[PDB]
Every structure is written in structure tokens, then in C-alpha cells.
Write a protein that binds this DNA or RNA. Sequence first.
RNA 1: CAGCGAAGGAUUUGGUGGAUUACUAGCUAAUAGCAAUCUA
Lengths: 431, 385, 48, 265, 28, 445
Amino acid sequence: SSLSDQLAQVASNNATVALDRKRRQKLHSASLIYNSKTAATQDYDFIFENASKALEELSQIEPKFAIFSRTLFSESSISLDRNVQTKEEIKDLDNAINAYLLLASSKWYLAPTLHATEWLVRRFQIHVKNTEMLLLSTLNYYQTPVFKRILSIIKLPPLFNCLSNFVRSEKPPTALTMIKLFNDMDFLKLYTSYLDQCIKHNATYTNQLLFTTCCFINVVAFNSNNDEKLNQLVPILLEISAKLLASKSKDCQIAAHTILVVFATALPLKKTIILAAMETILSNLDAKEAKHSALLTICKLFQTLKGQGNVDQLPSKIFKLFDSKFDTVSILTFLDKEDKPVCDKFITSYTRSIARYDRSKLNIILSLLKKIRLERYEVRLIITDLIYLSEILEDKSQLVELFEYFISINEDLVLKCLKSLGLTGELFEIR
Amino acid sequence: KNSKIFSPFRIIGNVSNGVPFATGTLGSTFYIVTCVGKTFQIYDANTLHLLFVSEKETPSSIVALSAHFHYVYAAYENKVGIYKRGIEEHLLELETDANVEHLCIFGDYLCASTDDNSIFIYKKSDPQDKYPSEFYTKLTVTEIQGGEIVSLQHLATYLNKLTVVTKSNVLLFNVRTGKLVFTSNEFPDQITTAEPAPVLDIIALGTVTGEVIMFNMRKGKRIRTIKIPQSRISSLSFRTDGSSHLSVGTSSGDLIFYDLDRRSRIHVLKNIHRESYGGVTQATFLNGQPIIVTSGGDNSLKEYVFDPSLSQGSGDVVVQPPRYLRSRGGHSQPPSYIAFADSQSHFMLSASKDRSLWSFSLRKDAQSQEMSQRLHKKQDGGRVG
Amino acid sequence: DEEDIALEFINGEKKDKLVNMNSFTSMFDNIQNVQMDTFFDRVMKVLT
Amino acid sequence: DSPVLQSAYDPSGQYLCYVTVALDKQRVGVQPTQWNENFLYLEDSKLKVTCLKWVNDTVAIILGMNNGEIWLYSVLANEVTYKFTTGNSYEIKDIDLMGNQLWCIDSSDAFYQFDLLQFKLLQHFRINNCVQLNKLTIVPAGDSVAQLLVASHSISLIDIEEKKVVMTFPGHVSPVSTLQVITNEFFISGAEGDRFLNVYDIHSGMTKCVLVAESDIKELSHSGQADSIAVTTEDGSLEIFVDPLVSGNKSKKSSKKIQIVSKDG
Amino acid sequence: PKVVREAKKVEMTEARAYNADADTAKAA
Amino acid sequence: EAAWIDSDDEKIKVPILVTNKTKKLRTSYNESKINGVHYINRLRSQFEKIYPRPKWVDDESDINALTKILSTTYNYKDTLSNSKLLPPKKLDIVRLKDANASHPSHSAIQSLSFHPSKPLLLTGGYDKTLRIYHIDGKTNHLVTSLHLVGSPIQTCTFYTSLSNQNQQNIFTAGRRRYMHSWDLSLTAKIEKFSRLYGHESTQRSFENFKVAHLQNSQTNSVHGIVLLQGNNGWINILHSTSGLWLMGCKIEGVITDFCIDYQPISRGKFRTILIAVNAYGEVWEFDLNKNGHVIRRWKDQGGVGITKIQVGGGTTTTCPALQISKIKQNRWLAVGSESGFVNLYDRNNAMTSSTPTPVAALDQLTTTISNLQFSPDGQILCMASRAVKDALRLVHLPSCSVFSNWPTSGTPLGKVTSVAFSPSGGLLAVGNEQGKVRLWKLNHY
RNA sequence: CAGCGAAGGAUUUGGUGGAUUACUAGCUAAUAGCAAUCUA
């Protein structure tokens, strides 16, 4: 290309190294704490000693920082220069920095981590070189003067380009701009990589997960009326949904339930992928809040299923697994909940599966059929499966009790299912 | 018949036909040898100009061609023609009436295979001259040993071995002593593509159901399997610039880029080539290059480049989707009506049965370009119907 | 009776509530110091 | 344009079987030629009649649909009796039968053998060097189940046992739309779009005559001994040639022309 | 301002490839 | 570790310094001919430094199934196969041939109907020439074209008897004081109903009528009814075969419109209800298989002058049944105003209310509405004005969301004055004032 | 205001790619080697 941009490239390459006094002070004056004319007279040992004090108090409030004392906040670290050593030890350096940054992603409400990280900024120059992990680790606190400060001193990466009119503006960046930051899969694959590192370090927490989930449902909201964009956007959100369920935290599990429920009501998925999602959210379900939320999200997932085969049998290994994680009386009291969420298609598939893969305890199906109301094709398919069951195994008092209940309400349904299969005289013969 | 007024000259405006092309390197250049019906053509890959053509046609249609450094090995009805700079330098007549199907070049031993699982392998008279000129031996795969042949190649770092890929089995050879060495396991469906990997001694092989098996021939096992729903696979390749990327090409006109380090679809490409003319006949990475050369059966050759990543810290996880780069095409159906544009006999116009209009240039064959159907807007207020 | 049972099949569907691009902007007002189960109940009540 | 999608006469010319479309669903109607109201409807819009032929002898149509089925359909019992499937879900392009044995031709260029007395698929073969193919005709020599004549865009001839091309013909610039044998040695070809039928010898391949209409051909009937060929033009007129094979020595013109105008202009 | 999705002049770097010539031998 | 042993390469020897490219993999300056397996290992390391060895080969050797199915498939929407219903907010229209194009019309298109089973469209306008087309997706022609002088027709429709289905009577009416019936028999015999038996002082016009079946309910003489409008509050129900005044019903306030809702009673019995509105917008819902006396009455939530009421979902005028057992209870009601606000009501809970709240009260088309009709299956609502161009909207329901993708501004609707559906085909037909009727179809049906 | 009018119309502008001369392949120490290397 041309000469001007051809060496603007090498200027951006060697922006980290100070070449004289003017660029040295224009590089040293970046700070998370002090302003320019104060920060231009600090030395390294001063900010190092107050940062080490900040670190040791931060390490007694969180016991996983003495390793960074031993290897990154040591006394030789003030002499360790970054851009004087080879690519392999700079790779060691910035993955250690990334470890520290995701570890200290939580603590940004309290000033010890500000004074702990400001020496890291001033010495290892993460505000120019290691900028990405810094931004998308502290992205949760976007209404805070720490984020306004760090965005005022940052050099802005090519991904976060929507924020470049929020540098040195007193207005914090707004939620709409955060959505427009999140609204391309070049950013989203990056952010899912970061969340994968947070999962496999268990550095997840209730505020980062809340913010992440809220921006993801807002991204799906903006891509509601773009079918090609939504189908383009599936295999990353569902990917970290499945990676989010693999962890142990109740909060990330119910965040996975949140993105799953909003995505299922966003677009109609297929039966095989929604069944894999159902068994996946069941296969790592431990805490009671996760039980409650997973039951709600399973019911809504199955409610947003259309086309034929919607109310069919869930198979045996997902059915017994659902019964292993959820006993029948939990289903009964959830149906006894007074809010009455619409769960008719899931309860229809549950009735057909308990009548086909257990065929033993029909007090359950009679009780919950009394407890909810249910629509006509659902009860037609239930009583068809009941006709087949009543002819394969011999009739019982429970079976004929629910049968005469379906006599007592809406006779011509079971009459027309007998017209499809036999005759009411033959059914009274099998009575 | 022979004539006495007009002599035929060249069939212009024609790029590919559906035969899998080949590629060759010269220094740090790349040339693409594609087939057009009977003659072939040699493009380069940097600016995608034409460079060479065969100086005279073949008797039958070319069924299979390959390319070493300077030389192009064409293969038609019974023979294999070793060519240099588009000029035929040596015929090689095979010792049969059977029609040749595939071939490979490695080291000294050329190896072609007919349509009855019979493999003529040839050898250079002097281990210093330029092309295999002398018949060495004739292997023959029998139906006990596997199915009927579908490819053959010598994958790397193998001391004078060879790999024949049948419809049911993989089977090696030691071509010096003419010996089979290792039949592979059984494979439960028809496989149709096998391309080697730039990692040590494994070969990726895709079936008529959409799975890619990765056979490790030194181990004799399979390493991984990429499953894909109901895709008639057609053409595999690997990317060799360090960052490992597999690339499958489905005859439904699809091009799927798989990562292999984390088994993820990087990006799909839909309807890149037309479905009905064969789909993706052959697609390959240029080695040491982050570009893709695809060619369909619909008279089109394309290049797709992979951009550098936008995540300067993350890097290999965030991969930018493939752009579109240079491409050369004609219309894919026989041209209906034909005119000459200028008095200088430089441009000519075609309009074809596939309803496209092209301005071919018979002077220099990178100037030919499609005319564009973008309506001038009605500046009196009307709407386009 | 096949179109009758098809018509009953399409009759047996209640009013869902779709998503649209300005339905979830209100969550950003109380993304602060809120337990995620209460967030899940909030997004389900704004959803249905 | 004609609202009849297609139509075909029974042999000896007493009934017409015609496929029309009626609220995005094709229906087949039969009609005698001196009211009948047994419209066989079709199921859905993705299922339309490509080609059809009477049989002769429980009276029946066979209808090749556009998915890989041949609906052998009786006319008396107003339903499809038998459903000849193929292995592929490809739309067929023509059918022709002789006695028991029946041939179908696919879009994927395969040739299919069927037998309407035993309801099997006898054999199944695609051949090289003929790709766009849309209509065939079995050549009769008594019991010549061999040597059928396949045609699109350059007419070919096929023995069913050696299974190779035995003789190619100069086709047309368009796909062939009518391919009717007229004697034991001559056959009419006629493409779509063109006014020019041509009689080809089936042994020497030389064009004997070129029949010139005055508009585009749509269909044609011929007498049993090829002494009279009536074609129907695209603009709705009719051109009947008398004695086309007797010699205007190379390109025979239209002998008689018939149009049906009302008295209302 | 949107993210600058921006192309560039592309260049073919140096190849570096195993060749098959060293894969045969001879009995001595 | 190798599954095979070549047993030939170990007895080979190669002088590696014969050429340039094979002389760098020496290790001393005195070694010339090397063994075969050593040679294999040397060039194998040369290959591994000429392309590095990545991790995915030495990874492995082939709560998970979500990742597995997600890495399997591409199209993440089930709607390719069955779909059984509509997709909301984006429908699959296509265009067909303009249904007036064979034999055009001259006046407006004030009435447009379909034969209930046969593939026939009827067009009727103020130029007093009721035409009937045979319609199809390619080229659709005129079967017949009755003209009748001195009677510019306003509304006209097909009718078949429920009992023996072989009647096929058109009914047509305009601003005059006579209407016409027609038994269609492929030269026509038409009768002119003008005998008003009971009430003769309430019709300045016949220009609004419906046709509806009813049962006898002591016998089963299922037969037709013409329902004509009057002037004060009068709507008169006649006979369709004979022409006898069956009875009449007056509501209080000026009639604006009315509709007919059937409901089954047993296997073979059914009951008809007439729904009528004011301009004020309090409706009367009275059965008329017994004598016409009000069995329900309630009030629309709003409207100053409401213009058009249409019931749908089950069977109705536009989607009629053929066998008596094939008749169905409706689901949706719709009321439309001069302000444009169309309320749509469910009728599975709102037989109990006596003041029902709307399911939705939508407003997208601004001006007054003129025509609104449901689908034959009750998933599309179709609303249209007679005031401005492109004044038609389509509403997916039960979700009650307007379709966004259609109609755009570039659709050639014209100033719409009538609209109708197919009974089965999902083939929609719109008519304007400048003469042409255009034809679309819905690819889900 | 009108009409034109297939699930939008009409404009501003960046970047890349192809042309703007008439298409015989790259490098070097060049009757050859290289393309993994010109070194002993």
C-alpha cells in the first residue's frame, strides 16, 4: 500500500517501546489512579510497593493470589522489561496476565484490586499490548468510573470499534451500545472463548453471568426478524449453552436455561436438537433452584415445538432419566402451582411416555389429567395409546376409572377413537 | 472432415468442465491445470491469467490429469501424455484396451490405473531424467482384495509405497517388489474421496454418506470421523499454513470448513458451485497459502481467501469467514447467440441457454467478463416491474 | 376426517408471545445485585 | 395459452385423457369423442403429471408423475390401481410400453424396465455418452423389445442387450418434443420451438424429408401406414400432410390447413 | 462507528513443501 | 506399534549426497550410504520440520449430545418437512397470473367469491355483468359471463345445498329492490326474487345479503336462507329455494353488518346463530333455527362507528361445509371500525363473559376498513379498506401479529375493494376499482 | 392528487477483486541445478 499507512503499521507495532523523553512521558502518564501531571513523576518502586500492599490484602481476602506474588508481583518484576525478551517468554507473560485478569475479574468493586492492577498496567503495559482480555474481563462494570477510566486510557482494539466515541466522554457507554458491540459473531466467538476459559477455571460469578446472559438475550432480540442471521447465530450460543451446563454452578446452569428458553421461543428448532438440549440440561442437574428453573425451561421448550410429531413419545433413555432427576410428585406439585404455566405439550408427551414405557402406575396420569386441562388432539392421542395399552395388557381398575372419566367428559372423543379402532361394544367387551 | 479454407483455432470462453483439476508449484508460484473437454489449460494462480493450452487436441476426452513441477500428465482413453509447457513431450501407451481411470506421480514411479483395477506403474530409465518413460510393472487388484478402484496416491514419507483407495477398502503397495503390504479394515459404505494430510502418514477419506474417516495407515486405524448429514461428499483438502483446517466439498454445491484442533465448523458455504453440474468437483488449499481454489462442473473456477484474524490476542479461535477473490468463468450451457462487437475482432458477445450474457475477449482471455443485469432506475417515478 | 383432525390440530394452539427487538432492554436497569433465579423468573414473566 | 397441461388419445381415437390444473392441483379427466366426470385428483402441488400413455387389455392410463412413480391408473375404477416406484426420487420424463414390457426414463438418465402383468422392476441401467434425455420410443418389429430409440437434442438408438449406442442422428438445436415412429424404417422427430419435423431412416440415418409447418409444432398424429401426418401448430391451427414419403423434393410443405374460427370473428 | 470489516491486498508468501523425489530407493 | 512391517526397506542403502535436496539430512561429513529404516526416520523428521506436527492427530482416537447434534446438522429449523401451521410475521406468498387478464372487466369489483368445491371464481361489479372464471396458476379463463341489464350488482355469491349438493345457485343483488337466483347448468334460467311477504317498508335496497344453511330441528330439512339488510334495524331471513319470508329480526340502532356462526349439537344436528352490530358497537347474538329471539347480547370495547364484522375460524360463508357432519363451531370473531381498529375475539371463553375483552385490538391500517375475511382454516385474517392504495394487511393468528414481509409498497394491489380466499388451495384473490383482480397463493397450504 | 408496480423503493460513499496493450510458468552463478539448500 502507501507509505503513510505502511509505516503507521510499524508505529502501532512499536507503540509500546519508548524511544525518547516525550514519548516516554506520554506512555508513562497512563494510569488507572492518578492523573497526568501526578502520574508522570511516579517511579516504578513506589507503585510497586503500594501495589504489593494492595495485593497482600487482596490475597488475604482471596487465597489464590500468592502465586502471582511469587511469579508476577515479585521484586524482580520491576526490572523485568516486557519488550526486550523473546516471543516464548512473552507468551508465558501474557498468559499469566490473562490468568490474573480473569481471576481478578470479580473484585473491581473494591479499590485493592485497582491498586493491584495499576502497577500491572504501568509496568507490563497491558493497556496497549494485552488489551482484549482486559476489556472483556472488566466489561461487566460498564456503568462504573473504573471502566470509564480504563476506556479513557486504553488503545481501542479492532473489535470494540463502537466504543470509540465513548473514549474520554463522561457519559458511560449505554446498554444499546453494549448490544451493538455484542451484535456480530466475530465478537461472539471471542466472547464464547473467554467464557470457556472462565468455565474451566470456575471463575464464573453471579454478576458476569447475569450481564452475559442479558446481552445474549438482547442479541437474540435484535436478531428476531432475521432468519438467516439467527440461523447463523445458533451454533455459538447453543455451544456455550452446552459448555455452560457442563459446569457445576447453579447460576451458570440457570443462565444456560435462560438462553435456551429465549432461543426456543425465538425460532422453532428441530425435535432432535431440542431433545438433546432437554437431556443435556437434565444430565447435570443438582441444586433445587436448577431443578425448578430447568422444569420451567423444559416446559417452555416443548411448548415452542410445532409440526407433526410434536407430542410424540420422548424415548426411553431420556424418559427414565427425566424420572430419575424428577420424581412424579414434583411434576404433580408443579402442575398444582397456581400461576399455571402453559405446559400442555410436554405433559402430553409425558403422559404418553409414562403409559408406554412404564405402563404400571396410572394413578399418576389420572391425577395430573384431573389437575390440568388439556386440548383435544392431545387427549385423543393419549386415549389412543390407552386403547393400545388396554389391549396389550389386561384391564385394571385404574385404567377403566380414567376411561370412564373420559366417558364422563367429552364422550364422542373416545367414541371416535373407537370408530377409528373397533367399536364401543368391543370396548365394553374389554371392560 | 478436414477442410481447405478454415482451420480450427481454439475453443475460447471455456474454463472448466468438471474433471478434478491439479495444481503445481514452481518456486513460489502456483499453476492450475484444468481440463476443458479434450484439451486442457494451464492458468496461474496469482493473477489467474491463462498461461498455456495444449497445442493440439486429444483423441478422446481427457478423463484425469495431474501435475508435477514442469510436467503435466494428461490421461484419456488408453494413454497418458507427459506434457511440458502445454506441448506433448512423451506419449505413454498402456498395455491394454481398458480405459484409464486415475493416476499419481511420486519419486520415480508413475502409476496409472484402468477401469478394471489394473495398475500400470512406470519408471524413469535414468534416476536423473525428467519424466517416467519406461514400463516397470503391472499390479492388479482383485475383488477379493477390495472393491473397484476410486483413487490412488502416494502419501508422503513412505519408502516406495503407494495407497490404492477402493470403494470398500484401503490397500497399500510396495511398488518395487510389486507386493501388497497392508490391506486395511473393512469399510461399511462406498467412499469417494481420499486426500492425504500434511501431518505424518494419515489420509482423509470421505464416503457417500457424509462422513470423513481419517485413516492412520502406519497405525492401520482410524483417528477421527467427521459426521455430516446426507451429503454426497466430493472433494477434501487440508490447509497447510500451520493453522490446521480441513475443507470438505459436497456435491450439493457446499464447501464446509472444519477446524480440526477443536472439531468445529469454521464456516459453511452454500451454493458456491451449481448443484446440477456436479457441485464442487475439486477444491484445494494452495499449500503454504491461506487461499482456496475451487472448481465446479459449471464452467467456473474460484478463489476464496482466508483473512487474518481480528482478535490479535485470541487468534486461532476467532477465524474470519472466507472472502471471495479472483474467479474465471464462462456460461455453463451452450451459447445461443453470438455476435462480434468491434471491427478490430477483439471483443465478442455470447448469450447462452442459461440466460447469461458474456463479453468474451478473444485477444486476451482474462478480459472476458459477464454483462450485468442491474436495471437503471426509472427517473420519472415508476417502480421496476 | 383427515382434514378435520388437521383442523383440530391447528385449533389446539394458544396465543404465544413472540420476542421483538425492544422487549429485553429493561433488564439492564436491574442487572445489578440481583440473584439469577429472580432474573430467570423476570425473563420468563416478560416472555409469557 | 392452453389450460390443458397435456393430453393424449387412446389408440383407435375414441377417448382423450387430459391433465389440467384446478386450484393448484392437477386432475386427470377422460372424455369420449362423439359427459364424463371422473376427475382423478392429485394430492398436492408438489406432484404433477409429467407424461402419460394409454394401454391396450383392461383399459387403463399410466401416468408418470414428477417424483419417481408410475401410477398405473384404471379409468373404470376411478383410482390409481398400482404405483410403480423407482429407487430414486427423481422426476421421470417419458414412458412407453409394448405388450407386457414397459420402459421409463429418468431425469438422472437411467432406463427402467417394468412389467404391468407382474409389477416388478426388471432391469435398471444408465449408459454413457447420453445425458440430457427426455423422451424415448420402443421401435416395433413384432417382438422387438430390443432397440429402443432415445432422444433429446441429438437422437440416439439403443439395443437393450449390448446396451451401447448403435446409431446417432442429427437432432435439433432444441430438446426434442415429439418422437414418433411411423413405419418399420422411418420416424418423425420434432423439437420444441421449431417448425421443422424430419423423417429419419432408422438404418442409414439419412434424413429423407423435412416437413415444414407454418408455426411451431405442438403434437402430431399419423395414420397407421404413414400416408398422412396431421400436426397441431402452436397457434392453434392444424396442418395435415398427405403422402409425406413420396416425391418440394426435400422439404415437404403443409398440404392442408384447418382452423376452427367461431362465427363471432 | 461499526467494526471495520476491511480487506487488504493479498500476497502469496513462500511455499515450503515436501517433495516425493526422496521417497524411492534402489537395491545396491 | 505398526500394524504392518514392510520387511524390504531395512535392506536398502541410499547415497544421500547424490543431489542437492537430499544432502542436508546427513549428520557427518564422512557418512555416505545410510540404512533404510534410519533413512525413513531421517526424512520423517524432515517432514515433521517442513510441516509441524499439530495436536489434533495425537488428541485421541475415535452431557455431550447437544454439542454432537449441533455439530451434525446445519439447518436448525424443522419447517422443511411438515410445518402444519403458519410461520408468523413472514409468509411465503407467490404471485400468479392476473385473474382478470383473459376477459377483463370495466367497473369496480364489488364482489368476489369461490365455488365451495369446484375450481371456480365469481366476479361481480357495477357494470352489471357477473362473470365466472375457471382459475389456475398459469392461464385462467372465463367459463361464462352472465350480463343482466338495469341491475348493477353489489354482492353475489355461490351456494350449494347441504343435503344433495347438486344445486349450485348463484345469488346476486345490487342497489335495486330485486335480487336474482341462478341454478347453474353449464342457456341460463334465473329467477328474480322480489316478493317481500311480511315487511315491504324496510328495504330501500338489497345490496347487503348473506346466505346460510339451517336445520329444521324437528325434522332435518336442511335448507338455505337469504339474509337481507334493511334500513332501521331490520335484517330479514328468507328462504333460498322458495323465496318465502321465514322471519325477520330488528335490532335497536342502525344495522352496519352481520355474520353467521353455526355450531354442532350432535352427530347430525347443528344450530345457526346470527351476529349483528350497530354503528355503536353492541352486538346481538341470536339463534334462528328456532324463532329469532336474542340469546346473547354484549358490547365491543370501543368504536364510535364500527363498519364490518366477520366471524371465522370454523366454517362460515366463505368456507362452507359439504356434508352436514362436516360443519364446525367457529373460533374467532372480528369487529372493525371506521377508525381502523379491528378487535378480534376468541369464542371458546367468550360465550360466558357478557362483556368480553379482546384478545387483540390491532390498528395497523389507518383508515376505515371495508372487507375482512378469515382463512378457511382460521390462521390468516385479511383486512382491507376502500380509501387508500395498498390498504390491506394480513394477520397471523393465534399469535395476532401482522405479517411484515408482505405486502410491501411494491405490490400492485391498487385501491382494494374486495378480497376472497380459496376453500382449500390457499389461493387468495384481491380486487380493486380500476378493474383487475389479482391472484396470489400461500405456499404453506 | 394520479398511475407504474411478484415477499420493498430511491439515493450517498469506503474497501477488495477483474479489465484498462496482444494471454509461452518462478529463482540462480543459466546448453544446468533449485523449487526442502548451495553447501565441504
